[PDB]
Ligand code: HEM
């Protein structure tokens with residue numbers, strides 16, 4: 063019948079012996095991260111395992127990784143692992159493949175330049191202020207703050223705004239249908255029963271498509287696909303520096319420009335990529351700043367220096383802040399929320415020594431590499447100075463990859479970084495953050511399939527009066 067599980071040893075690559083049907087998925091009770099590091103402790107440079115009958119080949123040599131992500135990104139390693147029933151979200155850039163992906167990447171790239179980003183800063187800066195007013199109250203309240211709630215609220219405020227021009231306080235408007243629906247767009251947990259099932263029975267994905275059962279909830283994609291050219295139509299033609307307009311502007315004068323539907327797919331996929339990723343990283347950073355008041359006041363002092371008497375951050379004053387950037391990247395080292403980068407091997411190739419067969423998912427265990435002893439001194443420590451100017455080129459760009467690498471890295475990187483930084487500055491420009499003993503110390507990751515804390519982060523918030 064199926065004859066998948068013989069592949070790696072038959073070519074000479076080590077790995078945990080698979081079970082019939084299951085492959086190695088029982089080994090996921092630990093979680094992706096724990097599983098990945100333990101594999102690297104025991105098989106070294108390269109190993110192989112099976113998500114069901116699907117061969118996954120892990121790699122950890124930096125120029126082999128450069129090779130996959132950059133080298134023949136186009137010729138061989140262009141797409142990611144198909145993962146569940148996707149419906150029309152087939153057209154979203156992150157999900158699209160080969161030429162359609164290359165088309166969308168090119169069509170969507172100009173929208174993410176540093177230029178258009180400088181023009182989005184005032185919009186998103188505004189919701190820094192909104193966050194502060196919303197944080198004042200729960201600080202002064204007395205009681206601890208659940209960070210993913212006040213950052214979830216910020217991330218959304220900033221998403222609706224730069225995506226559709228929609229200007230709302232998500233926190234204080236929880237039924238605004240436009241807020242209500244978009245919270246359901248959380249990140250996928252590939253260790254969920256559903257997805258695990260899908261992994262074992264991939265021959266059930268086409269079954270779900272028929273039934274229109276979809277990993278993006280029907281009701282949520284229905285409401286935004288509706289909102290979009292409710293608004294792409296003449297609320298627009300009254301005549302917005304945002305994502306939607308830039309995509310509209312590129313339907314209006316190379317290869318065939320953005321479809322109407324393909325545009326909505328993008329709008330949606332942007333939300334999905336940017337909402338819970340941003341809010342998560344922000345929680346992780348605020349956790350670190352709380353449990354290292356060493357870093358927190360040093361940063362607060364950098365912020366006041368660049369921005370005296372609560373001066374409002376600009377594009378340039380942000381890029382200026384070197385210790386802030388140090389804080390941001392060190393937290394992404396410890397908590398790379400993608401965990402893994404993956405590419406599907408389109409053809410038989412041999413990359414710096416070893417032959418990869420067509421069909422193998424080539425995987426880069428980012429979480430593991432970020433906590434590797436060979437490239438990192440004291441990997442478990444929160445130590446921003448590893449990213450100090452100098453001391454930071456020892457650092458291989460192919461070992462440290464919180465946003466991936468090559469032509470298919472995170473399109474939203476400069477934005478995500480800018481967005482997070484504008485939050486941090488205004489929040490630190492007004493408050494301090496300290497442990498309560500509801501605060502889990504030390505902090506544990508979920509054993510699940512999302513990089514997120516065991517229990518949500520709660521902290522004491524004080525005004526700098
Ligand atoms: C802290 C925030 C974020 C992190 C850490 C992050 C991380 C990542 C990673 C690791 C990848 C995979 C890249 C690869 O496989 O090499 C990715 C892809 C992607 N990200 Fe981000 N992301 C963040 C925020 C955002 C934002 C704000 C947006 C959009 C506004 C975004 C849009 C995308 C898209 C569209 C892709 C797929 C790109 C493609 O298929 O060509 N992400 N992200």
Ligand SMILES: CC(=O)[C@H]1CC[C@H]2[C@@H]3CCC4=CC(=O)CC[C@]4(C)[C@H]3CC[C@]12C
Nearest residue numbers: 249250251252254256257275276277278
């Ligand atoms: C947590 C998560 O990743 C979400 C994304 C897709 C979601 C699934 C989508 C399909 C689905 C339909 C149902 O009627 C029950 C819930 C399930 C089985 C969902 C369970 C939770 C999932 C797996």
